[PDB]
Structure formats: structure tokens, C-alpha cells
Symmetry: D2
Subunit: 235 residues, 4 copies
């Protein structure tokens, strides 16, 4: 019988040791206590799964790159293991995404009140992200379904953030960042990606007086990331 | 006969080529046209002399360090050239400071109106800085005079900024940064240095609504530098 | 039924994806085919387990550091999970070491001929290393046994390398590097560590004519690492 | 009246302070004592002028780059100062080269004996280099003359090094490095550049037994630089 405070302590310890699989597992155990998460427990869960899926996405990109070159090389003798190793990483990546998506759908989005608007946007942004990670590796009909699922999660998150959060709020800014990345990289819609990132940046600078003493550093950091992407995409 | 716009273009060209002596010389020529400087011409002058004096201060520190070791080494045969080379760098550093101080006293502070409060604080901060650079290399009675001169320039700048600028203004924040460094490093007053940097940071976060769309990045950068120094000095 | 060439391909693919656990597992499967390893398969096995044990050693150091501070902090409420998390990492580290040590004792050292002197030194250096990693985390009577085991493996490796390899050979140089680290860090014998590293470096420069066209870069790299450690330990 | 040992001490002090103009001036004063240079005084002179000309070459490249863009921009109002500032840097660069070339022709190459083969190759490599720096900024008939002058200096250096130095000697390796760069960048002869760098590298690995205890690190460093350039040029 392990206490909730000890599990959060375990996640913090795993983060310092860079053992993100342990970190994700501890925060998954906290979620499964079937109680709402604090703002702190929410970010610990987010950081854990971002680093776990990040390592899988990086590995998949490396092996897929080698796979495209091996097929072009003409050596049929080597293609078998490259494809199988890419598939192995791909299934691991998908299982990480499905693991987070089950947590969001059966616990986090399912049981946060209609009043906890910050929590709702935070979880729907995560949902958009993990369906986007699934979209990156998916093909054909499987791809179209997860793309729609990602779009649906980002749009709902966007509507609640627009209505209940200031344009400078790091959750609203972070959402605009990832949703515009989804338009650019997944939907291949550079105009809509640039518009979304421009609107978010301009709405934040127009309401710069709404910057909070506890999160102004996070706000200015994401505003810069939005401007960075806007520069990259428009050049 | 060289135009003012061409001299500012020369300073910008010298900055890109990292030829700061050329940059300082071009901005010194602009000042000597005996007209007020634009906000742009002011920062170009400031950046030029900061890089020129910065290179001299770095060289003086290196040779002074070797000088202290050579005297401790007991080799009297080598002390002569080290001391003379340190003295050579030292005179160059002092002549750079006197060059900037003459520009401020006979042009910049001398001819900006009682209404141009931003200009006044900007020039008195520069004056405090260049007397502080002189204090670093000076000894005895010579040191006490330049320390007083630095203190007098920073205090006047502090009074005008407190009265006519928002606590988040980068000129007011930058002034608090350097004036607290003067207390810590020159006056060896850690308490007064920490108090000055704390007050400035706290006044800025208390009036975070006064952040300007054109300079919020500069404000948040100096606020962080203040917090950095406060952490270093209190640990 | 997976081919030996495909398993080596899997290890190379895992190395590019930085999935060292996969890499170690593939090379463990190659070893278990119960045939000698090529020079290439040997280094792939060595690199795999070095990165696997390296991550465990780094994690153990981080959590042990936090453990020493938490005990000193006086918060008895937090000591329980830190100790248990350190113990968890520690058991993982020990199981990695025992896994490699079983491979060396039941396959690699057990079945390489009396003639394959390069192979013998290579495997006995690995044995010295993995017992040294065990010594780092062990205490009391358990520590003394693994220290002796490490010493015994390094000494045998040292005798065969002295007799059958040139002083510039990267395996002989690499052995002198790790064996001197064992004296310094494990045995706390700075004199014997410095002597071993000095002798190896001096023997290599005295026979610089024995440098091989295929490994001169590896030789000069380890010679520098020996000189680096010698500088650090003698200052 | 300043002693030769004090001037070399001044050059070493200037090098630590990164005051390369002072360093070059001190070594120019040593050369002008009209006596041969030691191996140490030779490298101090070489390092001084390399850093002085290096800063001019870097500045010229930056301003020439801006000049090509300003002419393409169509703003005739700005072209005047860019061209004049480039010309100013260019004359400084040329005067540095002529300063070194006068030292080599009226002192160093002029008065080293027919027996000091290391000194002869060292000075003729420098001569090839400084005429190459002149070739980089020169155009038309002026360019053809300095290109021939560079070629003539490198070829003579190449003949003496081939006859009196081992293929692993850092002076012979360094010569092959710069002479092949001259073929690639100045003469636009990629085949001849690759052949020269390949021959030098292959001659060095074929005589790896000729590596000296006092300069093996310099030899292996330049051998790698040759292999680096060979990779870049053949891909």
C-alpha cells in the first residue's frame, strides 16, 4: 500500500534520474487513485509522457530514415530487419499514446467538473497532442481517423480557452503553439498554421496587462516560440 | 564631409564586423555633430563603448592575474614587463573611460532638455558605469574620488527614473542592475546591493501591467538578471 | 529463427536509435549462439553494456546524492521513498553487471582459445570493469569480495597484454586507463594509480614506432586520457 | 632599450590577453633585431599574424557579404559607405600581408642558412599563405600576380620538405594542408587539391613509424584536418 504523496515523490525522483518510464508509471498510478490531479500532479504527468513519447518519436524518425535509405540501396537482405525494427518502435509509440489517451478519456477529462476550465483545456490539449503523435506514424484510413480525433480535441480546447482564459495564459498560448504545429506538419495548411500562431501572439501582446506574477516567464517563453515558428514558416 | 546617416551606417557596419573601436569612433563623431541623439544612436554609442571598455577590462584582469602570480613566483627578472604591460592596458582602459565621460559631460548630459527624462537617466547610468570601470583599476585617493563620482551619477539617475519611469522600464531596471553591482563589487556592501536589486525586481512584478509591447522582452531579461545576481549574492 | 547477421544489424540499428537496452539484448543473443565473437561483435557488446550500466550508474549517483541530503534535512517522512528508489536502481545496476559477468564467465572467457590473446585481455578488462561497477555500490564484506574479483581480473589482463601486445595497442592502453581508475577511485591508492598510468603512457611513447595504421587514432586518444587523469590526480 | 627576452615575454602576455596586434608588433620587433628566430619565436610570430590577418579576413568577408546584398537591394544611397568600409578593411588586410611578406623577404628567408631546412620550409609556407590571403581579396591582373607568387612559395617549400623532412613532420603536413586549400579555393582545382591532400595523408600513414615523441599530437591533428578536407571536397 503506497501513498499518493510517495508516488508524486517517486515521479520527482525519477525525473531527477532521467528515468522517464518510471516517472510516467508513477503518475499513471496517481491518476488511477481515481481522484482529480493538482496543477503540480498534472504537469508531472505531462512532462513524464512527453519525455517517454519523445524518445519513441526520435527513435522512430531515426529508423524510418535508415529504412528509406536501405530500400533505395537495393540490398533486399537488410530491408527485413530495418522494417521489423521500425515496426517494433512504432508499436511502442502507439501503445504509449493509447496509454495516455485512456487516462484522459476514462479519468481526467471524464471526471473534471464543468467549472475546472483550466483542467479541461489542459487535458484536451494533451488529447490533441497524443492523437497528433499517432497521426505522424499512421498511414491511409488509420491516419485520417487519428487526424480528425486530434483536430476535434484541439478545437474543443480552443473554444474553452478563448472563453475562460486570458490570451497570455500559458495553457492558452501552449495550445495555440501545438494546434498551429498540427496545421503545419499534419494538415499541411501553412496559411491556417500561420494565422493561428499570429492571432495568439497578437492577442497576447494586446492584453500584455493580463500577465500574472506567477507565470509571466512561461507566457513570454511560449510567445517567443510562436514568433519563432511564424518566422520559420513564413520564410 | 561625411553625413550623420552615413556615420550611423558605419557604426552598424563596424558592429557586424565586430570592429568595436571603429564603431565607438563613428558614434563619437555623431555625438560631436553637437545635436541630441535618437534612442537608436544612444544604444549604438552605449554598445560600442561597452565592447571597447569590455575588451580592455578583460585584458587588464588577465595581465593583473599573471602579475600577482609572477610577484609570488619570486622571479624578479619577469615582474618588470608584466607590470609595464598591465600599466599599458590600464592607461588604455582609463583613456576609453575619460573619452566616454567627456562625451557625457560636454555634450549628452550638458545639452539634453529638463523634459527628456529617459535621455537624462540613460546618460547618468553610463556616467555611473564608466566611473565604476575607473574604480575597478584605481587605488588609494584616486579610487575614493572615482567611487564618489560613480555613486553621485547612479543616485541622480535613480531619483529621476523613480519619478518619471515605470518600474518595468528597461532603463530603470538596467540602472538598478548596475547600481546594485556597484554596491556589491565596488562598495563591498552586500546588504545594500541585495536590497536595491530586490526592491527593483519586486517593484517591477508589482506593476507587471506597465509592461510595454515594444520592450517587454528587455524588461523580463533584466528582471531575470536581477534575480540571478540576488541568488548569487544571497548564497 | 533469427540469423546472427540480423542480430548484429539489430544491435547497430538500436545504437543509432540510442536504445541501448535493445542493443545489449541483441548482443547478448549473439553471445548465446555459443560461438566466438568477431572484433566487431566484441566492441558492439562492450558499447551496449557500457551505455546500459552507465545510465544505471548515473541514476544511482543522482538518487544517492538526494538520499544523503534528505537524511541530513531531518524529514523522516521523505527518507523511505528515496532509499527504496535508490535500492531499486541499485538492484538494476547489479543485475546488469551479473548479466555481463555471466556472459564473460560462461561463454567469452570460457571458450576463447589460449592463442586468442587480444580476445582474452579484452574480456578480462570487461570483467575487471563490471566488478568495479559492483564495488562502487557495494558496502562491507560484499564490497571486499567484488574489489578482489576486480583486482584479479585486471591483473590477469595486465600480464597477458604485457606479454602479447605492443604498449601502444588500444586494448593494452584502455586496460591501463581503467585499472589505474580502479586504484584511484576504488582502492584509494593515488600513488599506484599514478604509477600505472605513467608507466603505460611512457611505454607507449617509448615504442611510438609500434603505432598501427588501423588504430593509431584510438592509441593517441587513450594516451591523452591517461595524461589527463595523471594531471588531475597529481594536482 | 628593450631586451629580446622581454619582447618575447610581451608577445606571450599579449597572446594571453588576446591583444594580437600587440603580439604581432612585439614579434615584428624581435625579427627586426636582425638575428635568426628560435622554433618558439617562429611559432609566436606565426600565431600573432594569423590572428591579426584572421580578424581582417573575417571582417572583409562580413562587409563584402553585406555589400553584395546592398547592391542587389537597389538602395544606391547605402552602397557608398558599404563599399568604402569594405575598401578600408581590405587596405588594412593587404598592409598586414605586406608587413609579414617584408619580414620574410628581408629577414627570415633572406638570412636563414642553406642548412636550416625546417626554418626555410616554415617561412616559404608563410609566404605562400600571405600571398593566398592577398589573392582572396584581389581581382584582375593584381590577382594573377599574387596567385603566381603564392604558388611559387608553396612549390619551393614542398620541394625542400619532400627532401629533408619525414612525411609525418607537422611542418610538411601543415604545408600540404594549406597548399591543397590554395588549389581548391584559389586555383579552383579540386582534383589537384584532393591529390595533394591524399598523397600527404597516405605518405604520413605509410611512414607512421617516423612519428616523434615531441610532435606526434600535432602530426595526428593535421592528418585528421587533411582527411576532413578530403571528405568535404570529395562529397
Amino acid at each position: 500500500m503506497v501513498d499518493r504523496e510517495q508516488l508524486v515523490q517517486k515521479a520527482r525522483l525519477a525525473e531527477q534520474a532521467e528515468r522517464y518510464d518510471d516517472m510516467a508509471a508513477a503518475m499513471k498510478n496517481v491518476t488511477e487513485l481515481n481522484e482529480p490531479l493538482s496543477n503540480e500532479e498534472r504537469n508531472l504527468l505531462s512532462v513524464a509522457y512527453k519525455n517517454v513519447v519523445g524518445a519513441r518519436r526520435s527513435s522512430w524518425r531515426v529508423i524510418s530514415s535508415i529504412e528509406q535509405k536501405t530500400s533505395a540501396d537495393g540490398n533486399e537482405k537488410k530491408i527485413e530487419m530495418v522494417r521489423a525494427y521500425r515496426e517494433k518502435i512504432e508499436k511502442e509509440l502507439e501503445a504509449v499514446c493509447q496509454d495516455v489517451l485512456s487516462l484522459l478519456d476514462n479519468y481526467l477529462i471524464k471526471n473534471c467538473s464543468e467549472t475546472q476550465y483550466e483542467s479541461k483545456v489542459f487535458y484536451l490539449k494533451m488529447k490533441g497532442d497524443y492523437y497528433r503523435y499517432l497521426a505522424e506514424v499512421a498511414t491511409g484510413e488509420k491516419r485520417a481517423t487519428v487526424v480528425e480525433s486530434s483536430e476535434k480535441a484541439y478545437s474543443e480546447a480552443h473554444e474553452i480557452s478563448k472563453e475562460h482564459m486570458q490570451p497570455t495564459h500559458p495553457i492558452r498560448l501552449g495550445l495555440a503553439l501545438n494546434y498551429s504545429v498540427f496545421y503545419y506538419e499534419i494538415q499541411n495548411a501553412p496559411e491556417q498554421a500561420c494565422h493561428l500562431a499570429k492571432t495568439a501572439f497578437d492577442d497576447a501582446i494586446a492584453e500584455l496587462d493580463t500577465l500574472n506574477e506567477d507565470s509571466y516567464k512561461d507566457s513570454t517563453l511560449i510567445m517567443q516560440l510562436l514568433r519563432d515558428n511564424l518566422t520559420l514558416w513564413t520564410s
